[PDB]
A = this chain, B = another copy of it.
Amino acid sequence: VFGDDVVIVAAYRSPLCKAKRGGLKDTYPDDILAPVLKALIEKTNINPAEVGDIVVGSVLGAGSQRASECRMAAFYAGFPETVPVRTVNRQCSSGLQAVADVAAAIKAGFYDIGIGAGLESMTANPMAWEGSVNPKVKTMAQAQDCLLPMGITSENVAQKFSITRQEQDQAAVGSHRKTAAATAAGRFKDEIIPIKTKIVDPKTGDEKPVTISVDDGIRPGTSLADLAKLKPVFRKDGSTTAGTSSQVSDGAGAVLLMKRSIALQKGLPILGVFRTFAAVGVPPSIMGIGPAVAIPAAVKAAGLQIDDIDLFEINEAFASQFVYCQKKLEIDPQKINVNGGAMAIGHPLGATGARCVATLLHEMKRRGRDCRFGVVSMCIGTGMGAAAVFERGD
């Protein structure tokens, strides 16, 4: 416990909801994030003015608008005008990148307290390419591969590493199962911050107040034969379907970080300890192998071995990719996404990396002293991987 260590004193998330049709479909992006930010301050009772930066991972839609929405969200959360905000984009990993950026800024002495967060409204912001494609793109295989549908990327991993259709459907079953179980056991209660918003009837245009407090994408009764009947989205002879892919979702996560010495001075319980972060490049055509490369790097940097990790949050972008990384790193599947994953809960692009920190840390805490090390990791569109090692708090 060195005073300069970067510790987490709070980590929360919104419920994650189905894009377009889910509970947050009529909720402004700033209204998803603001309550989550505010909860960090409510939990620790720090003066919000003490926060050095609020860094928000976010992926879709126009950059300038989303950065403005983040500034407004902080104002709604009660932060004073003196506290600045920014966004970061490393695609699927943006929310975790934000946490890592705050950890780096603290270690570099830029400031002593910061917030790393993630936000996505896949309801509000489509994922389409704007304008024409540079003709030069096709002249470089790796550049062209960046334009591949993520789904095709899934199929590629499936074939190259022999991931059976059944293995894939299995993991989706295991996800829906574990997510429903966790929800019933109240394992998401501590990490979730309810969103007080509105639901609008499209036929009339009428608004009515609603409080979203639970993830709405889970399908408890999903059967291996329900999934068997699904047709491949990206190929005729493929093995990737809507049921073996993450769901499109809306949501937000946020993490409060500070020097250990500060948490001590303020007498704040430590939820977790940031240890290491890695972001590496891999081939765009099989971007799914991201964690297989990033996890070893972060673990190695943490002076650890893979077996030393007790809990993993490995994003479920595709079952194909999810299973491969498990097999490849030879990790006990009982240690991965113990409370379910994006196939069941959803993948609001920018929020995922931040919300997974909250999911990881709170679960590590519930498992007590013997759950000492955890990892958040994900594959990343255009061919990258990220991983962060976290240690138990107290």
Interface size range of chain A in the complex: 35 or more
User: With an 8 A cutoff between CB atoms, is A323 at the interface?
Assistant: no
User: With an 8 A cutoff between CB atoms, is A62 at the interface?
Assistant: yes
User: With an 8 A cutoff between CB atoms, is A305 at the interface?
Assistant: no
Q: How far is the CA of A56 from the CA of B67 in the complex (A)?
A: 15
A142 touching B88, Cβ below 8 Å: no
- Using A81-B284, A90-B84, A280-B84 as known contacts, say yes or no to A59 and B63 having CB atoms under 8 A apart: yes
Q: How far is the CA of A82 from the CA of B279 in the complex (A)?
A: 10
How close is A347's CB to chain B, nearest CB, in angstroms?
Answer: 13
Write the A125-156 contact mask toward B (1 if CB under 8 angstroms, else 0): 10111110010110010110011000000000
B283 touching A81, Cβ below 8 Å: yes
Q: How far is the CA of A64 from the CA of B85 in the complex (A)?
A: 19
User: With an 8 A cutoff between CB atoms, is A75 at the interface?
Assistant: yes
- Using A72-B143, A107-B108, A142-B75 as known contacts, say yes or no to A89 and B67 having CB atoms under 8 A apart: yes
- Using A75-B140, A109-B107, A136-B31 as known contacts, say yes or no to A59 and B65 having CB atoms under 8 A apart: no
Residues of B close to A143: CB separation below 8 A:
71-72, 75-76
A86 touching B81, Cβ below 8 Å: no
Residues of B close to A81: CB separation below 8 A:
142, 281-284, 383
> Secondary structure of the A side of the interface?
mixed
B72 touching A146, Cβ below 8 Å: yes
- Using A28-B134, A108-B107, A130-B125 as known contacts, say yes or no to A63 and B89 having CB atoms under 8 A apart: yes
User: With an 8 A cutoff between CB atoms, is A105 at the interface?
Assistant: yes
- Using A137-B72, A143-B72, A143-B76 as known contacts, say yes or no to A64 and B90 having CB atoms under 8 A apart: no
User: With an 8 A cutoff between CB atoms, is A53 at the interface?
Assistant: yes
Q: Which residues of A contact B (CB under 8 A)?
A: 28, 30-31, 53, 58-68, 71-72, 75-76, 80-91, 97, 100-101, 103-105, 107-110, 124-125, 127-131, 134, 136-137, 140, 142-143, 146-147, 277-284, 349, 380-384
Q: Pick 7 A–B contacts, CB within 8 A, sort by A.
A: A59-B63, A67-B91, A68-B146, A81-B142, A84-B384, A86-B88, A124-B131
